[PDB]
């Protein structure tokens, strides 16, 4: 029978974001978000590495995107289709742009939402100085 | 480029002169050479967009020189009866057919001058500024296409 893993300590990670393409970066963040990188993978338990990102505003994006890219927030009320361009998100809470990126690449299941928690994001940098901080590119 | 003081930077160029220093955002993929007392620039290749970038900066840098050199200034004619202009310190107020006398703010680096109630020059140190400041005046009261009134640069009559 295939290996039956057990409790594993959360491996935190420190991730840059300057000049990093939105999609290309989110990809690695998600794959590392779940323990999919470690050969001891197990979709059942879900034990992905705690990813913490900084320098959110620094994220690059190709061609017409700051102006073209649109987001959609729909309330249950009529006409509540409220939509926002990319430039505005960077103005308000910019961390959002990357979150809605990773969130979109995370699985639809409940545990996936549990993974989205493992994902921390800001722009300064300066994370909540906890302990772990294994830098990466 | 005599007597000037063009100093090269990464993505920009700082030109200096009798009038003063002025920044000019230079394109990224361009070589701002400083041959002798003069200045040259070359493009990384021979593509369509590159051709536009060379000629653009080619003149845009020439502006930074002339700007701090002999300075810029456009004239402004004024046709009509009550149409006139009184200089008031820095700013200039001019009644031109409106119930409210127009108060025109003087932007930094620019100092328009009033040699006559009709004629009005526009001293400056940048083509972009002076060019805008000029239109900003013609915008207040465009030339009546039925006779002579409102302000004019110096061009032909609207007739």
């Amino acid at each position: 029978k295939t290996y039956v893993p057990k409790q594993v300590e959360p491996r935190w990670v420190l991730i840059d974001a300057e000049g990093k393409t939105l999609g290309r970066l989110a990809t690695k963040i998600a794959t590392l978000l779940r323990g999919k990188h470690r050969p001891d993978w197990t979709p059942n338990v879900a034990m992905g590495d705690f990813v913490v990102v900084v320098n959110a505003d620094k994220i690059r994006v190709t061609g017409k995107k700051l102006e073209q890219k649109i987001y959609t927030r729909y309330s249950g009320y009529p006409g509540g289709l409220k939509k926002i361009p990319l430039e505005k998100m960077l103005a308000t809470h910019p961390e959002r742009v990357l979150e809605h990126a990773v969130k979109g690449m995370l699985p639809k299941g409940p545990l996936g939402r549990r993974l989205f928690k493992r994902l921390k994001v800001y722009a300064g940098p300066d994370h909540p100085h906890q302990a772990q901080r294994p830098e990466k590119l | 480029p005599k007597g000037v003081s063009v100093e090269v930077a990464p993505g920009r160029v700082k030109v200096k002169g009798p009038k003063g220093e002025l920044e000019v955002p230079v394109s990224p993929e361009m070589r701002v050479v400083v041959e002798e007392g003069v200045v040259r620039v070359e493009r990384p290749s021979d593509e369509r967009r590159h051709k536009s970038l060379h000629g653009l900066t080619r003149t845009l840098i020439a502006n930074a020189v002339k700007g701090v050199s002999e300075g810029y200034s456009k004239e402004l004619l004024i046709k009509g009866i009550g149409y006139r202009a009184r200089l008031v310190g820095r700013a200039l107020e001019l009644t031109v057919g409106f119930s409210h006398p127009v108060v025109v703010e003087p932007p930094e680096g620019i100092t328009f001058e009033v040699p006559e109630p009709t004629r009005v020059r526009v001293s400056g140190i940048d083509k972009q500024k002076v060019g805008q400041v000029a239109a900003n005046i013609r915008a207040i009261r465009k030339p009546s296409a039925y006779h002579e009134k409102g302000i004019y640069y110096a061009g032909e009559p609207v007739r």
Partner: protein, 204 residues
């Protein structure tokens, strides 16, 4: 950004210089500052204003400590006022000069589970020719298979009134500091006894 608590006492009309004017009588008793919250200590500027006196026995709560933290008679009620750090230890009707307009927030009267016609001022239906069943009804509410649901926030009969309401631009008439009273341009939310706040309007 002036601000002061008070209670609706009633309203009658006065005479300006020679013309009649309906005016409401507010009572802005001395409101002691309880806590000046700066952006440092919190994240926004404001001030807690106490109000009516209180039986010290009823306030056995830790509020006793909150009152002592500023050394003040135990008040009955206390609310904040955004962007407003005044002076001294107490605000007064002296804050408002006659002529200035003010916003008064209050609690409207409770009309309970009001009918739709009573609430949104609908139209109901015919009183004669039609069936004697839909006299005060809303009638239709939606379409057919599409959408097949009901638009959220649709106007329907239900509990209504007895909520936060804010009239605006009420000009402050004659203000008598001799008794802590304060006259206004009449119409004001809340019953004769409710707690109302008075702030600076936004004319410009």
């Amino acid at each position: 950004m002036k601000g002061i608590l008070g209670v609706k006492v009633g309203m009658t009309r006065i005479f300006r210089d020679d013309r009649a004017v309906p005016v409401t009588v507010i009572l802005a008793g001395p409101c002691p500052v309880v806590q000046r919250r700066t952006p440092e200590k919190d994240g926004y500027t404001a001030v807690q204003l106490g109000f009516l006196p209180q039986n010290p026995k009823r306030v056995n709560r830790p509020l006793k400590g909150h009152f002592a933290k500023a050394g003040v008679e135990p008040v009955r009620i206390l609310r904040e006022i955004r962007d407003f750090n005044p002076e001294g230890d107490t605000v007064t009707v002296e804050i408002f000069k006659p002529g200035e307009r003010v916003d008064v927030t209050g609690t409207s009267k409770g009309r309970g589970f009001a009918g739709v016609m009573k609430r949104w001022n609908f139209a109901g239906g015919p009183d004669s020719h039609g069936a004697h069943k839909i006299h005060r009804h809303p009638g239709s509410i939606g379409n057919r298979k599409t959408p097949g649901r009901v638009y959220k926030g649709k106007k329907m009969a239900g509990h209504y009134g007895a909520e936060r309401v804010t009239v605006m631009n009420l000009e402050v008439v004659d203000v008598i500091p001799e008794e802590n009273l304060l006259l206004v341009k009449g119409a004001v939310p809340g019953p004769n006894g409710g707690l109302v706040i008075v702030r600076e309007t936004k004319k410009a």
